[PDB]
Amino acid sequence: SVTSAKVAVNGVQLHYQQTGEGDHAVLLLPGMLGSGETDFGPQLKNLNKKLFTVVAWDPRGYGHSRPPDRDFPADFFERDAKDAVDLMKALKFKKVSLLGWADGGITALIAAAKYPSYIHKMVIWGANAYVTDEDSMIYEGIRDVSKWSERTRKPLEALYGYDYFARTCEKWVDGIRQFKHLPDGNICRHLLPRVQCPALIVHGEKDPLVPRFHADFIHKHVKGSRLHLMPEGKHNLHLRFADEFNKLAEDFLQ
Numbered sequence: 001s002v003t004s005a006k007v008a009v010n011g012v013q014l015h016y017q018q019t020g021e022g023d024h025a026v027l028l029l030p031g032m033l034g035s036g037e038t039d040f041g042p043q044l045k046n047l048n049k050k051l052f053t054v055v056a057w058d059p060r061g062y063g064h065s066r067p068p069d070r071d072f073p074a075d076f077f078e079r080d081a082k083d084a085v086d087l088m089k090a091l092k093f094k095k096v097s098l099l100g101w102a103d104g105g106i107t108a109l110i111a112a113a114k115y116p117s118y119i120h121k122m123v124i125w126g127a128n129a130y131v132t133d134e135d136s137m138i139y140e141g142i143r144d145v146s147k148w149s150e151r152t153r154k155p156l157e158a159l160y161g162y163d164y165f166a167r168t169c170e171k172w173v174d175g176i177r178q179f180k181h182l183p184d185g186n187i188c189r190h191l192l193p194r195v196q197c198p199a200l201i202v203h204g205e206k207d208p209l210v211p212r213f214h215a216d217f218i219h220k221h222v223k224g225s226r227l228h229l230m231p232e233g234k235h236n237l238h239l240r241f242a243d244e245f246n247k248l249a250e251d252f253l254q
């Protein structure tokens with residue numbers, strides 16, 4: 001049983017889905033153009049409702065957190081990180097664990113580093129702490145949504161309508177590529193050493209969007225972190241291999 005609602009946070013009405021009665025609060029952070037509805041169905045359904053209280057939020061401009069429309073200023077990951085934590089605080093949780101996917105994992109890393117007393121544990125996958133030429137090329141190949149597979153386009157087209165979906169994807173590409181021009185193509189390399197909570201980095205070895213060196217790098221600089229490789233996992237491993245992933249996550253969080 002899942003409840004959808006909005007809460008006022010930093011000038012925006014953020015949408016989120018909540019389920020479970022557990023004492024361990026968990027926030028699910030979606031990736032680019034994502035939402036709880038499109039990125040975390042299996043988790044909102046199967047994560048242990050007795051152990052956890054699960055919340056899946058929609059970053060401003062994504063999912064149902066519209067208005068406003070999405071924009072990508074240089075600090076957009078930090079803005080999302082603040083919104084995410086403020087949302088959970090608005091919902092009265094005293095401490096929470098984070099499950100972040102891709103852009104959501106980058107967001108989770110930032111939140112753990114900036115608000116260490118609020119984060120218990122963290123599980124991230126498909127995230128990159130910086131942008132390289134190889135990444136830039138990958139992003140460019142994603143820009144045109146019309147060339148996306150029909151299966152991956154359907155859900156987002158239905159949620160946003162073609163126009164917003166196409167336009168926001170282009171702004172995302174320009175928004176994430178902007179980091180390549182900064183020293184070290186940095187997004188959050190500098191915050192990794194500041195993560196103080198136990199972290200589990202999962203990586204699908206067949207992920208075509210995020211080279212494994214990004215997971216190795218995050219693992220290297222996040223003290224006490226654990227890295228788990230899934231031979232058959234791709235970028236959407238928590239969806240394609242939901243049962244396997246959920247077990248990995250639940251075991252780590254306990």
Ligand SMILES: [Mg+2]
Nearest residue numbers: 183184185189
């Ligand atoms: Mg450097």
Ligand SMILES: [Mn+2]
Nearest residue numbers: 015058063064
């Ligand atoms: Mn939503």
